[PDB]
Design a protein around this ligand. Sequence first.
Ligand SMILES: [Mg+2]
Ligand SMILES: [Mg+2]
Ligand SMILES: [Mg+2]
Ligand SMILES: [Mg+2]
Ligand SMILES: [Mg+2]
Ligand SMILES: [Mg+2]
Ligand SMILES: [Mg+2]
Ligand SMILES: [Mg+2]
Ligand SMILES: [Mg+2]
Lengths: 147, 114, 171, 48, 183, 51
Amino acid sequence: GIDHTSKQHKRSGHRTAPKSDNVYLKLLVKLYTFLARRTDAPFNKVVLKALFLSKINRPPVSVSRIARALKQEGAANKTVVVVGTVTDDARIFEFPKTTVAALRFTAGARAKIVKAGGECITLDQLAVRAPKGQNTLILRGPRNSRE
Amino acid sequence: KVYKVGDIVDIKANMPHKFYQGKTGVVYNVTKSSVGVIINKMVGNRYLEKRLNLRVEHIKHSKCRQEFLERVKANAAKRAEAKAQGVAVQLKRQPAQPRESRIVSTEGNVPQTL
Amino acid sequence: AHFKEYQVIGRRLPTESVPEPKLFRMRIFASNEVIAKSRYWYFLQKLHKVKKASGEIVSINQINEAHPTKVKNFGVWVRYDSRSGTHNMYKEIRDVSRVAAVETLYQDMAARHRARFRSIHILKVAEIEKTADVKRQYVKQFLTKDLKFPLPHRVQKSTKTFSYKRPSTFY
Amino acid sequence: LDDQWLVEVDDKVKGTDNELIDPRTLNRAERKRLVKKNEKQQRRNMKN
Amino acid sequence: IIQAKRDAKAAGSYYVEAQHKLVFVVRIKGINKIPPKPRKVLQLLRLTRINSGTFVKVTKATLELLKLIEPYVAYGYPSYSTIRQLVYKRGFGKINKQRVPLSDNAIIEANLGKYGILSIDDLIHEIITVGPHFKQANNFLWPFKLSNPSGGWGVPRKFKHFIQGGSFGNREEFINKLVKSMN
Amino acid sequence: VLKKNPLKNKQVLLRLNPYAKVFAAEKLGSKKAEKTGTKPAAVFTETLKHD
RNA sequence: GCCCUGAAAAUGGAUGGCGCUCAAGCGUGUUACCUAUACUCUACCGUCAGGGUUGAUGCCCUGACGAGUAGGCAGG
RNA sequence: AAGCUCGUAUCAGUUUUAUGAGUGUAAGAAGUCCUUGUUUGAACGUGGACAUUUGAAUGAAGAGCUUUUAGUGGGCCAUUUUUGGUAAGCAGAACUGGCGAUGCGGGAUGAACCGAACGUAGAGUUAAGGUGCCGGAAUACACGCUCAUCAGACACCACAAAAGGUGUUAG
RNA sequence: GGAAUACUGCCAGCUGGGACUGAGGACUGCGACGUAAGUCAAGGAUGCUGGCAUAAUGGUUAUAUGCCGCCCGUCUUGAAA
Ligand SMILES: [Mg+2]
Ligand SMILES: [Mg+2]
Ligand SMILES: [Mg+2]
Ligand SMILES: [Mg+2]
Ligand SMILES: [Mg+2]
Ligand SMILES: [Mg+2]
Ligand SMILES: [Mg+2]
Ligand SMILES: [Mg+2]
Ligand SMILES: [Mg+2]
């Protein structure tokens, strides 16, 4: 016998794998697992962690929020990255020309960004363009606003 | 002898509640007559806060932080001196060490059998 | 165990403006030096007002027997603990060594007086120089001139289960 | 209770503005109120 | 030390040697029916199972812990041969929270090279002479997992004091014989 | 894959301690001490023989 | 100190039994010996943990752990 | 069980030091220095600055904050403090252990006694208890005591008046 | 006065007998003996030989011997009671 100081067979946890069955989402998880292992890039770590979250923990990000984020000084030419859905917003009348990478775009938000003159790309295209996440700005949506 | 809220005091009687002898608490209530003392008491596997009301003569100022304040001042002075003159300085307290060797001489001190 | 005799010399720890404390020496019978130092501190606290945490051990030295091959008569003065109080006892042991005499006394106390090592105190062991000073009959009977005695009814030890001859107890 | 060296504070007093009051003073006030109530009852009986 | 003892005897004095700075402690009782304070002290000294041993630096803070756990341990003053054999045969390092055998000097150099310790002999030196990095070296050493004594405990009943014919307490220099038997 | 005891395996002993070869060659495990003629004091002898 | 008396009922029975008297009884000392799912070393199963990896919720390397009613989770 | 953060982070049924009582408190960013503003002193502050010799030992890789829900609750025994006692048992408080949910070795047999906590095996060594035979293991060695017309091999309480005896041994 | 021996301890001194185990599966590493190429007991067993080639080993089944094993479920502190 031994007088254990701590619990035995304790799981670390930390959301090892996603609960989804989307084959494309699993492919993205595979690509960013490879990137996070073989780059030592904190951006890749953050994107890999965000790809494991549930729907209620991945709230949508508005195009008006994207515009407010781009209004920051020195960020007018950075690539906005949202691990989730980008929704449209009719409360804003001027939208800048920018590149946005996201899991999903609504039809209105995609039309608004393309009409402003930028491009909507996916996470694999983002990985090809910036393998270490150079000049990227990760945005998260509001959490407690829902109940 | 004026007691204020937040002072650390010792409970010392000059019959009931004999458990509160030697206990140390924090002053929270001061009146013209009595003093209120916070006591953290062990119940089961947790600590609970209790309000005690005492006469003025049955408490006194506690000096439990006096060594801490004096040591802080001495450490500041020694650190200033060692910054003025470059020297390796040890500031942490150390436990009592085992003693070194010695020679004991029987010069007039011849051992006596008892 | 097999007893050994030690001298233990100790003292109080030297203090400020009171240097060179007086040395105290005891002769202790024990099986090893750890037990000897424990007995020394016990007796020092019992007699003087000196504690182990306040004192120190200056020296401990084994004392050998001067003539271990010379048969001697010993008077042993001891005292033991009791509810009534401390009682003296004097015994006489014929032996060739102080430590073996002490071991014989301890065995005799364990057999007769139902006593224990921690409860028995060895106060003094003195060789009786003159045969006229021996005053116990069970020792005096072995001091007679031209002492002879047989050993009747000898029992031999067999290493085998069965013997083919009836045994004899002759000697 | 007035001469008692140490009085534990009741749990039910907390949450009200009467927490700062000396419990010895509170009990003396309650005793005097009881005595005056007895005197008023005696006066009522004498009136009746 | 030998010549200082002789020179003191020639001059009529007594040479008092320095107190031991190091002890070795072996847990002798099992994990059932241990009172809470000695149980906590045994956990703090990393004696979590029977026949587990560790080195302890002797200070006023550690003497009281040893006094608290006296009925459940056997401890004493180890010698150089005992320490060398313990480290050579049953020495394991704690690397990334794992128990790693010390079969090469490169392991010790990679894990304790910042303190100036480059080999198993340097580790033994830091143990035997309680140096500036004794705490780090001792905590690097995994607690020693000793077997039962090969010749037995030498007594009929273990759980009396060593003075009173038992096995626990401070046995000083006899801990070397006991630990070499258990090694 | 397997722990080898330097107290028994001479190759592992030499791998862990290069000075072991010098120790064995110089026979430092049986080093003779220098003979000296120091005598104890009469006070020490009398105290040792004292009752 | 040991021994005897120092009160006992009622089917036939108990230091566990046999039996034992310089003991196989009592006090003590020194050794040797016997053996637990305990300790030490090794192998194997599973769990957990830490690393590596362009049938990848797979593969490789290393380390430590394993009692269980109500109840919980997981794989079959 | 989920999230968020932080991770020389957060601490600890332990000790030490200082200070109380006949076990309590304290041991640094919820700091410190200068500079002199608030109602010649306490108490609140303006601006600048010192770190991996950031303030005892030992140990520890997970800690903190929000949400979130299954089973349960008046049990026995023992040890230590303390108050009242009875023919005698004991009765009322405080704390801590063992057991229920737990097998294994030993005590012949067993709810709380001794040892020890449990994956499947091999080898070695032991614990507690033992080694005349049942029965694995010395009818070992050594020093003494005892003879019981149902000794003893016992729990250490009672019978028990430390009473009776021309039993024996040592004081 | 000159020794020896006992006791305790140390050796990176030498050497004999016995038992259990052989995980891993190209190489890599740390070392040793060697001027040298190489060799080795150094990051886990190989070499040589005999008999049998089938009920011989082994499995299954019926029984014998040594030791261990109380009748389950439920409900009650707790149950052989
Ligand atoms: Mg286990
Ligand atoms: Mg053996
Ligand atoms: Mg035993
Ligand atoms: Mg028997
Ligand atoms: Mg006997
Ligand atoms: Mg037999
Ligand atoms: Mg009766
Ligand atoms: Mg067969
Ligand atoms: Mg049976």
